[PDB]
Amino acid sequence: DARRELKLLLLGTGESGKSTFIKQMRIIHGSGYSDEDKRGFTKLVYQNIFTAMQAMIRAMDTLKIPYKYEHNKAHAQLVREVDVEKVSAFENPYVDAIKSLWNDPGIQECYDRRREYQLSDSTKYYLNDLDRVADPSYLPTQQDVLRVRVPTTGIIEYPFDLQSVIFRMVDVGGQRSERRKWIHCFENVTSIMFLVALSEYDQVLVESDNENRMEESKALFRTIITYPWFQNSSVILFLNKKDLLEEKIMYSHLVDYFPEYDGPQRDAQAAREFILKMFVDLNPDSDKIIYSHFTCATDTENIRFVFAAVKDTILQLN
Amino acid sequence: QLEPPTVVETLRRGSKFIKWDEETSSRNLVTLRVDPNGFFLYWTGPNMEVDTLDISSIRDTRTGRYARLPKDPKIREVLGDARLEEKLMTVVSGPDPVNTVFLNFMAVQDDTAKVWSEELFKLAMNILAQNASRNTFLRKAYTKLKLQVNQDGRIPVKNILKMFSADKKRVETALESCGLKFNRSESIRPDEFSLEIFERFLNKLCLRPDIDKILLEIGAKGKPYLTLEQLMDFINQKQRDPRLNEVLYPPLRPSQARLLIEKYEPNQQFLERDQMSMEGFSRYLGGEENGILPLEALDLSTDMTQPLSAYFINSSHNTYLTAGQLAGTSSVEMYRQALLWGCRCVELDVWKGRPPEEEPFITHGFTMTTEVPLRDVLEAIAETAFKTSPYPVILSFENHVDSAKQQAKMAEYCRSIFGDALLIEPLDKYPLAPGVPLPSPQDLMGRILVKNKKREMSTLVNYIEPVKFKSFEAARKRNKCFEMSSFVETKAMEQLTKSPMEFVEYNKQQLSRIYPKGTRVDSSNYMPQLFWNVGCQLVALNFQTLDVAMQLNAGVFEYNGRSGYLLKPEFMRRPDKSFDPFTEVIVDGIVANALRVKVISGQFLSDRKVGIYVEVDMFGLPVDTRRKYRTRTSQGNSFNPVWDEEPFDFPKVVLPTLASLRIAAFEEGGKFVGHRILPVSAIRSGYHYVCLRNEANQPLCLPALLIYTEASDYIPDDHQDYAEALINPIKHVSLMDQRARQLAALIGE
Ligand SMILES: Nc1nc2c(ncn2[C@@H]2O[C@H](COP(=O)(O)OP(=O)(O)O)[C@@H](O)[C@H]2O)c(=O)[nH]1
Ligand SMILES: O=P(O)(O)O[C@@H]1[C@H](O)[C@H](O)[C@@H](OP(=O)(O)O)[C@H](OP(=O)(O)O)[C@H]1O
Numbered sequence A: 001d002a003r004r005e006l007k008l009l010l011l012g013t014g015e016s017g018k019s020t021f022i023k024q025m026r027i028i029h030g031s032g033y034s035d036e037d038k039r040g041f042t043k044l045v046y047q048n049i050f051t052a053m054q055a056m057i058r059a060m061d062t063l064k065i066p067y068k069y070e071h072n073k074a075h076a077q078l079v080r081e082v083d084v085e086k087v088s089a090f091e092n093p094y095v096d097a098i099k100s101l102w103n104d105p106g107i108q109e110c111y112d113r114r115r116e117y118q119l120s121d122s123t124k125y126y127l128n129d130l131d132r133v134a135d136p137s138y139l140p141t142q143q144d145v146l147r148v149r150v151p152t153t154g155i156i157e158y159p160f161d162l163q164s165v166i167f168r169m170v171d172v173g174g175q176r177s178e179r180r181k182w183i184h185c186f187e188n189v190t191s192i193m194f195l196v197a198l199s200e201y202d203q204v205l206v207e208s209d210n211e212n213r214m215e216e217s218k219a220l221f222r223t224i225i226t227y228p229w230f231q232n233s234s235v236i237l238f239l240n241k242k243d244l245l246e247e248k249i250m251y252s253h254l255v256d257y258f259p260e261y262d263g264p265q266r267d268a269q270a271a272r273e274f275i276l277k278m279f280v281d282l283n284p285d286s287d288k289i290i291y292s293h294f295t296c297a298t299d300t301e302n303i304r305f306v307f308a309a310v311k312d313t314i315l316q317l318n
Numbered sequence B: 001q002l003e004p005p006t007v008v009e010t011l012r013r014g015s016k017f018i019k020w021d022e023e024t025s026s027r028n029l030v031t032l033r034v035d036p037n038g039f040f041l042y043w044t045g046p047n048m049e050v051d052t053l054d055i056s057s058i059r060d061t062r063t064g065r066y067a068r069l070p071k072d073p074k075i076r077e078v079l080g081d082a083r084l085e086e087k088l089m090t091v092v093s094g095p096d097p098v099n100t101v102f103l104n105f106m107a108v109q110d111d112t113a114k115v116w117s118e119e120l121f122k123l124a125m126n127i128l129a130q131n132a133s134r135n136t137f138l139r140k141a142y143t144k145l146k147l148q149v150n151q152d153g154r155i156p157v158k159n160i161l162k163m164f165s166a167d168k169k170r171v172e173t174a175l176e177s178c179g180l181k182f183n184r185s186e187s188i189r190p191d192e193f194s195l196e197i198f199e200r201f202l203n204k205l206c207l208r209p210d211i212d213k214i215l216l217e218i219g220a221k222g223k224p225y226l227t228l229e230q231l232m233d234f235i236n237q238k239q240r241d242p243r244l245n246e247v248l249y250p251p252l253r254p255s256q257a258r259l260l261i262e263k264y265e266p267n268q269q270f271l272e273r274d275q276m277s278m279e280g281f282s283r284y285l286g287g288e289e290n291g292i293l294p295l296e297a298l299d300l301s302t303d304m305t306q307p308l309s310a311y312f313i314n315s316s317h318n319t320y321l322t323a324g325q326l327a328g329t330s331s332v333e334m335y336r337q338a339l340l341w342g343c344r345c346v347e348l349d350v351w352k353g354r355p356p357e358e359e360p361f362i363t364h365g366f367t368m369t370t371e372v373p374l375r376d377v378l379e380a381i382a383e384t385a386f387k388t389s390p391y392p393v394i395l396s397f398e399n400h401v402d403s404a405k406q407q408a409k410m411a412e413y414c415r416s417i418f419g420d421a422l423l424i425e426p427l428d429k430y431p432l433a434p435g436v437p438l439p440s441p442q443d444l445m446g447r448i449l450v451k452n453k454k455r456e457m458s459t460l461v462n463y464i465e466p467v468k469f470k471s472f473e474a475a476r477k478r479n480k481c482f483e484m485s486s487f488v489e490t491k492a493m494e495q496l497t498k499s500p501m502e503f504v505e506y507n508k509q510q511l512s513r514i515y516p517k518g519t520r521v522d523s524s525n526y527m528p529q530l531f532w533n534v535g536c537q538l539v540a541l542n543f544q545t546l547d548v549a550m551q552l553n554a555g556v557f558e559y560n561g562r563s564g565y566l567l568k569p570e571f572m573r574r575p576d577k578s579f580d581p582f583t584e585v586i587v588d589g590i591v592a593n594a595l596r597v598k599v600i601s602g603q604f605l606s607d608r609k610v611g612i613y614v615e616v617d618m619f620g621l622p623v624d625t626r627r628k629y630r631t632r633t634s635q636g637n638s639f640n641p642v643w644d645e646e647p648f649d650f651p652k653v654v655l656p657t658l659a660s661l662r663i664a665a666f667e668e669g670g671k672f673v674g675h676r677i678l679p680v681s682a683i684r685s686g687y688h689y690v691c692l693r694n695e696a697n698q699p700l701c702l703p704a705l706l707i708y709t710e711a712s713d714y715i716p717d718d719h720q721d722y723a724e725a726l727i728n729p730i731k732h733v734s735l736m737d738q739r740a741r742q743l744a745a746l747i748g749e
């Protein structure tokens, strides 16, 4: 009956996890996803697959990559004329077309350079597992729902009735245009929860093709914590996508994008900590302890372990 | 897949009908056609003179049973039961529900009327056609001239003078400069009257110093040319809605801007270098891409899966009445006209039938008004209910039939005439229990829902049981969404000013119907916005009276594909949220907006030299509602008035989804020219033509305004600097880290 309600803010640059995290809340704490709710995502997964492939097809022209196998030019022309908005089925010839494209070394080499254009971070996850998706009785798994991509806009609040307290978490859009709207959720904020894609260290924004994504996230975090609305607010910092860092850090070197890095190459742990340091260290206009956490928002158990802790930190301070 | 209007070949080449007439009994064999673009239904009748019907003015097409039958036996002698009536077509068209004319045709051929009727309707109710670009409405005028020709096929000059009758001395000098004929007594070969030449006639007729000004503004000091990137930067920076995501709604790429040059620029010397001229730019301004609205708005692109109480519903009060309350006609046609126009709640004041036939009939509370039998009204609903919208139609009864024999009859009349549509038991998913929400519009598609009092007519009631409202406390105690209550205007106003928030909360689960006070004897309307602000769904109005109030209603319900249902704002639906409808300051969670409407110019606004002024009003929450703005009346010019005006600001729109901008032009004296309702949350930014509309929201052709809108998200005064840093943090933090690094040596230690 008489529960207290606290209001948390999911803030970050675009494509960092905010919405995914919210799903994990809905799974762990919220109502979850019934098999009914999963069929709603089937269209979205189909669209993702096209979008991802069309992105790579344009990138073959942009980056000037030859299609290894001749007949894929025909497949390439088939998939690129599709309007993804009107997609609601994954039947032939498109299933075989995209599979045939995904198999092409030229398309694979284009994937190896996804840094140089805008490609989603669930593309390999989906495009490898096409057979399960092509299936005409296909029902997306819980992980399929987590990996799906749907850009957020405006200000959405999601309450979660946890036993002791209710968390009105407010998901927002991360892109630059969206940040103008953020002020209309700044009143009476218990805690800010900032998400940062650890993987974005060598990537440039969608809205700006010449500016580094982490440089922006970093800069955004430093600004946002020193705002009048957040005097009496804790600041949890989620450094997300740790799995992608471990994966990427083998070939792309952090030294090349942040020249004030002193640790060794191909070491994921050293790099994630540098990035944590970058965000919190040497801040003259900040005096609040920041409770960082290395998250992977697509890993239900990691988030179940992580957030249950963040809860005990928030309630303690209130 | 909202496809544009296509005229099938049967309508292009045409078919032979005999246009007959109830009144004068004029039999004329004619060939009905439709022009390629689908603007006009036309036919040659008397001797050789061409009649045109403007398809945008078509309200309904009827065939078979529903085609008006010839009462006069003299005509019916010339004509000739089932297969005879199979080839009848009645076209209904008019500027409002009340004033409609009927054009009865009959085909000579078999099952031909059904193709014309159905296709004429498809064109008449087409959405892109109603929301056509400015250039398309200009091309519609070109067509009308090329259609209506004399008996020897030529375009007479005196129609070009009729169309542009404002300054006929200018139209003469316009036509001479093109090389066309300019005397009132002579005509022009269709051959010689090219669209390209008509396009040049328009240019020389009306100078665009406003568009010249806009070209200087953008950049081109050397004005007669414009680079591709310039256009791109203009389109991306000035013509783009800034409330939108850069990923979901990307900016224009140069390749896309190239396709716009090829689409519009006439000069091949500019086009070869990827550049644009005033002509091409002016063409683009009124182009298919540069509308004031995005298609989504107009399209049926709203969620329809929410409970029925979560929607504003288009509603009629005493639908049967055509003019007055106390004395006036009772028409069955109005039910047709209401439902065809997207009304989803129509009222029926049923009364106890006399002892000869014992037939239930409809009329006003024993006033000086005529009568129509119930049986007929139900047949009219059956016909038109879902003709323009697949979503449920609530039947607002007002039963004054206390005889059991007629009660069982009118229930049969409902059962037999509607059949499968009529919802008689509750659905499996939504029982009539406590704690159950109403079914969604989606779930009740193609269902008639009766709203009648209880304790045979009651057993039909299920999801809309009316009850005598005690209080918002008593309603919450019960927690039954299937129950609802109607409220007379003044009693609704009482609950509005006293219990505004409890009203919203009530409306989150259950339905409130609202009708005008009984003292509005001349069918006067109350502002429906007043009760949409507290979430009232069924705000009933008099459709016969097209004042400002109905203009709004008709205007706003257009959106969401003329479905009749409009989704309420998030905070007026969600149980866990709450806010004060009388709030004078922004609500947290709701992104407020700020609007900047500026009236630049207007073209072909009236058919006689007169001064013209333009109003800019907003309708929303009381804090949003500001309706006192007005331009200065132009100096007796109607062709191309150019208002050198200060911008009309709306600095804080608290709840933009509820907010609706209204732009209306008037003659000096106050005579209505044309209006437009634009949803504030959807309206675009930069320079756009606002093609004006009549009071019943029918698209007018030539009267259009040019406006400059700015519609961004709201930023308070003190928090302007803070916002800039959220939008571009690298800049701010970069300076701070530089300042500190410049102080490096000086600190030391
Ligand atoms: N591999 C991986 N992908 C992630 C992780 N977190 C989020 N994503 C994906 O990155 C994309 C962007 O996530 P989203 O929550 O939409 O970002 P938002 O715009 O900040 O809400 C989605 O496809 C997610 O599935 C992660 O920890 N690892
Ligand atoms: O049209 P008028 O002349 O204003 O008459 C009223 C109006 O038709 C209401 O809709 C009706 O309530 P319903 O919503 O129940 O039809 C009411 O009857 P009531 O007061 O007996 O309910 C009438 O007095």
Ligand code: ALF
Residues within 6 Å of the ligand: A012, A013, A014, A015, A016, A018, A019, A150, A151, A152, A153, A172, A173, A174, A175
């Ligand atoms: F890119 Al987002 F929510 F920040 F989809």
Ligand SMILES: [Ca+2]
Residues within 6 Å of the ligand: B318, B347, B348, B349, B398
């Ligand atoms: Ca009535």
Ligand SMILES: [Mg+2]
Residues within 6 Å of the ligand: A018, A019, A020, A150, A151, A152, A172, A173
């Ligand atoms: Mg998101």
